[PDB]
């Protein structure tokens, strides 16, 4: 089964980097910026393959949603444990992955502020269509990425505590719980990349002349 | 006790920027400039272990380059405890 | 597969229970004696099936030779250890087994000694052909059975030590060996049981008249 990529383009409105807000997270958007850095094309784990330790039997086609996940279903009835698994990258499935860093355009920068960068990620056929030093229009989805650098920032950082109300307990003896911080930053996942002119407004001659009407 | 086959004249030639998801676990032929290299290090090839209870040196086990090998049974004192690799009887191969 | 049993009979010479010597161990033999005690019919493990603790895959049709044995092959390549197994009694194969105790005939007992017993073991179709209180002739093989009661007997009891000559060892530090006692007693494994007359020389009339010439 092949991977299909749906690319949307030509949105009515193109937003700046500074107009990116949190109410548009997980929504279709079109932004623009100057590419300053590009990354190497790397494989991203799409459909992982896992072996249970006790089963020693493998399962296939496990969907990976951003952060690395392991299924707890374990359809083989040999064992009774769910958490322990082992990843095999030989028969797992991957996708193309590139992370290009974009910067605010020179005319879009406000009166006193410095330009702010954004790490926009290209997958599939859109990889390597972005080049360092040109203005590009990225159409995609505003996604959210875990961030660790917000630990010392002011303000109440949200946290996720496990709800214990329907769990029966006994005071037999012989009280630890798993709580994690929810700190995040805004990233972009682009499906279509078009390179607008770096100006205000392929060496062979034949390939250039077929381009013109 | 080891012969390496060196495949030559592979027909397709790839550059480093067009390596993709489809080339994983496959034979590729890429041109390039060697930029920096590390020193020659010994990598385990025929790994021999010893048991910490009885002291017996266990038989050679082939070490593949994919991942570390490990054993849990002694075949002499029948225990699953700590085993240690000794470099005196272990065979090594060059790595760079 | 059907289990076949070969029964031999009409041996040229019937030996006494005191004529039993260790030179005939593992040999075809014919004895006679008076049955005193019979056990009930019990299942004996013939073709055992074991599951490996790490494989969770079963191997079947393992030969069982007297004392309980576990294979060390582990033909599935999932794990690398051999000593660990779990026995399944439901799908394993068994045999009929009866331990019948015989005593020396009163005319065969020597001048001063008391009668001595022997536990002869019947398997298959020969089971329950021996009845408490009759003189029976057993044809079979003189086998040997591990015995614990010979601990305090005088004389040098043979022992089995593991030979350690060709194994490489190092004195790194952090000396135990497995040694067994070889003490045994003579038993009988009968394939054919015939009940000769308890005298010196079936209620229906028709079944009795069918037997006579
Ligand atoms: Zn499992
Ligand atoms: Zn040992
Ligand atoms: Zn196994």
* Residue C32: partners with Cβ closer than 8 Å, 6 or more residues away: C14, C16, C17, C105, C135, C136, C137, C138, C196
Distance B82 CA to ligand 1 centre (A): 26
User: Which structural domain range is residue C79 located in?
Assistant: 43-95
Same domain, C104 and C34: yes
Same domain, C20 and C103: yes
Distance C18 CA to ligand 1 centre (A): 61
Distance between CA A137 and CA A33 in Å, rounded? 7
- Sign of the torsion formed by the C-alpha atoms of A42, A45, A47 and A49: positive
Distance between CA A115 and CA C136 in Å, rounded? 108
* Three-point CA angle C7, C9, C14, nearest 5°: 130
Residues of A in contact with B21 (CB under 8 A): 43, 94-96
C121: how many CB neighbours lie within 10 A of its CB?
A: 20
Same domain, A118 and A19: yes
What CATH number is associated with residue C37?
A: 2.40.50.140
Instruction: Single out the residue of A177, A125, A126, A180 nearest to residue A157, CA to CA.
Output: A180
The answer to whether the beta carbons of residues A202 and A208 sit under 8 Å apart is yes
How many contacts, defined by CB atoms under 8 Å, are there between A and B?
12
| Burial class, A197, CB count within 10 angstroms (exposed 0-12 / middle 13-18 / buried 19+) | exposed
Distance between CA C64 and CA C168 in Å, rounded? 33
Same domain, C57 and C140: no
Q: Which ligand is nearest to the CA of A83?
A: 1
Q: Is B53 on the interface with C (CB under 8 A)?
A: yes
Name the residue facing C83 among B53, B78, B89 (closest C-beta). B78
CA of A44: which chain B residue's CA is closest?
Answer: B21
Distance A85 CA to ligand 1 centre (A): 8
In sequence order, the β-bridge partners of residue C192 are C139
In angstroms, the separation between the Cα of residue A63 and the nearest Cα of chain C is: 26
The answer to whether the beta carbons of residues C56 and C86 sit under 8 Å apart is no
DSSP-assigned states of every residue in B18-81:
G--GGGTTS---B-------PPPEEEEEEE-EEETTT-BBPPPEE--SSS-------SSS---S
The answer to whether the beta carbons of residues C99 and C39 sit under 8 Å apart is yes
Residues of C in contact with A79 (CB under 8 A): 56
- Cβ–Cβ below 8 Å for A41 and B19: yes
Residues of A in contact with C79 (CB under 8 A): 56
A-contacting residues of B 1-20, CB under 8 Å?
A: 17, 19-20
Distance between CA A148 and CA A152 in Å, rounded? 9
Same domain, A77 and A138: no
Distance between CA A7 and CA A129 in Å, rounded? 14
End-to-end CA distance of chain A: 39
Could you tell me the maximum CA-CA distance found in chain C, to the nearest angstrom?
85
Same domain, C77 and C119: no
Residue found under tokens 């590729």: B28
Distance between CA A66 and CA A26 in Å, rounded? 13
Same domain, A38 and A111: yes
In sequence order, the β-bridge partners of residue C120 are C100, C188
The answer to whether the beta carbons of residues C113 and C144 sit under 8 Å apart is no
Cβ density class A128-158: b for 16+ within 10 Å, e for less: bbbeeeebbbbbbbbeeeeeeeeeeeeeeee
The answer to whether the beta carbons of residues C116 and C18 sit under 8 Å apart is yes
Same domain, A115 and A38: yes
DSSP letter, residue A188: E
- Cβ–Cβ below 8 Å for B54 and C176: yes
List the chains bordering chain B where 3 or more Cβ pairs fall under 8 Å. Answer: A, C
Give me the phi and psi of A23, to 5 degrees please. -75, -10
The answer to whether the beta carbons of residues C59 and C70 sit under 8 Å apart is no
Distance between CA C8 and CA C204 in Å, rounded? 31
Name the token pair of A119.
């790490």
Q: Which ligand is nearest to the CA of C78?
A: 3
Q: Which ligand is nearest to the CA of C56?
A: 3
Same domain, A132 and A48: no
Distance between CA C187 and CA C146 in Å, rounded? 10
- Cβ–Cβ below 8 Å for A96 and B19: no
Q: Which ligand is nearest to the CA of A73?
A: 1
Name the token pair of C129.
């052909």
Name the token pair of B7.
């495949």
Distance C54 CA to ligand 1 centre (A): 12
Give the DSSP H or E segment for C209.
helix C205-209
CA of B58: which chain C residue's CA is closest?
Answer: C168
| Burial class, B53, CB count within 10 angstroms (exposed 0-12 / middle 13-18 / buried 19+) | middle
Same domain, A103 and A189: yes
Give the DSSP H or E segment for A206.
helix A205-209
Same domain, C52 and C84: yes
Same domain, C191 and C132: yes
CA of B57: how far to CAs of A115, A153, B64, in Å?
64, 57, 20
Residues of B in contact with A94 (CB under 8 A): 21, 24
Q: Residue A155 in 3-state DSSP?
A: coil
Residues of B in contact with C167 (CB under 8 A): 56-57, 76
Distance B81 CA to ligand 1 centre (A): 25
């Amino acid at each position: 089964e092949r991977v299909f990529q749906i690319s949307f383009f030509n949105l009515p409105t193109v937003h700046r980097i500074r107009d990116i807000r949190s109410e548009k997270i997980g929504s279709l958007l079109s932004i623009s910026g100057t590419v300053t850095r590009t990354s190497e094309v790397r494989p991203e784990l799409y459909k992982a393959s896992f072996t249970c330790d006790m089963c020693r039997a493998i399962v296939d086609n496990v969907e990976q949603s951003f952060k690395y996940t392991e299924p707890t279903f374990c359809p083989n009835p040999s064992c009774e444990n769910r958490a322990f698994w082992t990843l095999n990258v030989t028969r797992s499935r991957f996708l193309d992955w590139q992370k290009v860093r974009i910067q605010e355009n020179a005319n879009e920068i406000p009166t006193g502020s410095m330009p702010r960068t954004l790490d926009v990620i290209l997958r599939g056929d859109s990889v390597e269509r972005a080049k360092p030093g040109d203005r590009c229009k990225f159409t995609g989805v505003e996604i959210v990425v875990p961030d660790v650098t917000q630990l010392g920032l002011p303000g109440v950082k949200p946290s996720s505590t496990l709800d214990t109300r329907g769990i029966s307990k006994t005071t037999e003896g012989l009280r630890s719980l798993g709580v994690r911080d929810l700190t995040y930053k805004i990233s972009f996942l682009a499906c279509h990349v078009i390179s607008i002119g770096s100006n205000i407004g392929e060496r062979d001659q034949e390939v250039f002349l077929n381009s013109l009407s | 006790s080891e012969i390496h086959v060196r495949i030559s004249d592979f027909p397709t030639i790839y550059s480093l920027r067009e390596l993709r998801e489809s080339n994983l676990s496959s034979l590729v032929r890429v041109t390039g400039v060697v930029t920096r290299r590390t020193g020659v290090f010994p990598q385990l090839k025929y790994v021999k272990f010893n048991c910490l209870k009885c002291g017996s040196i266990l038989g050679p086990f082939f070490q593949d380059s994919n991942e570390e090998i490990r054993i849990s049974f002694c075949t002499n004192c029948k225990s699953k405890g700590p085993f240690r690799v000794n470099g005196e009887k272990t065979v090594y191969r060059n790595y760079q």
